[PDB]
Amino acid sequence: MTILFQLALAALVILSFVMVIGVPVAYASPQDWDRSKQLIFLGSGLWIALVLVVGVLNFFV
Amino acid sequence: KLPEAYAIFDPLVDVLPVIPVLFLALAFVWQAAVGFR
Amino acid sequence: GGRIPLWIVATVAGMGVIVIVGLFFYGAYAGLGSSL
């Protein structure tokens, strides 16, 4: 699962880039805040899951 | 070296430590955007 | 007059200066004058 592990880590890196750009933008823009709130929650959850996935997939790779 | 499954992320690691300095620089950029009010 | 914001101009000029001086330090480590 080396290609799977590399894909999961690449997804984690890309999502980290997206959230690093977007969380301060969403936090500092009140005008659409409700919608961005859900995305932030989703992103955070997904990011946490990806971290866990990568950690487990560290040991089987 | 890093573990081999992380090998393709070796260049990114090579630029990771200088990220805090940029944060300091980022402050000035932000202060330039608001005109140093 | 003020179509391009001055903070963008300052950021781009400073990043160019940073790139140039980083190139100068890289050339301190490579090629002529690198002791290798």
């Binding site: - | 630029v15 950029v29 932000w30 | 950021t11």
Partner: peptide, 30 residues
């Protein structure tokens, strides 16, 4: 090669000012 490190550092060093530019464009709390 070195081009990969340069691409990564360019993306990060633009990711900062991209946040600033996006906040200024949409009139954020910036």
């Amino acid at each position: 090669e070195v081009i990969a490190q340069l691409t990564m550092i360019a993306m990060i060093g633009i990711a900062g000012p991209m946040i600033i530019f996006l906040l200024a464009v949409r009139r954020g709390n910036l």
